[PDB]
């Protein structure tokens, strides 16, 4: 239980080419079935000041030390609390639930 910061939302904003000053938060993190990969769930609305929030998934690979954006288009109210599980598959298939 000695560890170092993996990443932060500022570097994620730089990587995702986001215009900065947007609202980016990490809802959850989960190891997928790949032994050396982990997916981080992000809530973003570009300084929306609106209840709606786009939900995105970014997968971090420790072999390559590389972050990759994923095709995830879901939109939620900001009040939702999201938890997700990865299923038993080679491909990244997930189950989310927002209470």
């Amino acid at each position: 239980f000695r560890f170092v910061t993996l990443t932060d939302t500022a570097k994620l904003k730089d990587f995702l080419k986001l215009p900065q000053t947007d609202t980016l938060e990490v809802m959850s993190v989960e190891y997928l079935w790949h032994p050396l990969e982990a997916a981080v769930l992000l809530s973003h609305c570009s300084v929306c000041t609106t209840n709606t929030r786009n939900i995105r998934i970014v997968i971090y690979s420790a072999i390559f030390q590389t972050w990759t954006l994923q095709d995830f288009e879901l939109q939620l109210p900001k009040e939702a609390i999201l938890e997700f599980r990865f299923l038993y598959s080679a491909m990244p298939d997930i189950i989310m639930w927002d209470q």
């Binding site: 995702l16 080419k17 995105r56 954006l69 994923q70 095709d71 995830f72 288009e73």
Partner: protein, 58 residues
């Protein structure tokens, strides 16, 4: 519903990427549409019609 079931493929649009088209798009001269498959590599194909699409993927 009967015969086949529709589903749409759409990727890379997760964020509002804005890449404008360069040049003048090609169009198949004939009214009917056609799909020409590379015989050896099944994945590579060309959709010929109103607009021409050359896909390395299927």
């Amino acid at each position: 519903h009967t015969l086949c079931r529709v589903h749409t493929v759409r990727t890379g649009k997760v964020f509002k990427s804005n890449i404008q088209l360069q040049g003048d798009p090609l169009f198949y001269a004939f009214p009917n549409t056609f799909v020409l498959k590379n015989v050896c590599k099944a994945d590579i194909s060309v959709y010929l019609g109103q607009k021409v699409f050359l896909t390395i993927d299927n």
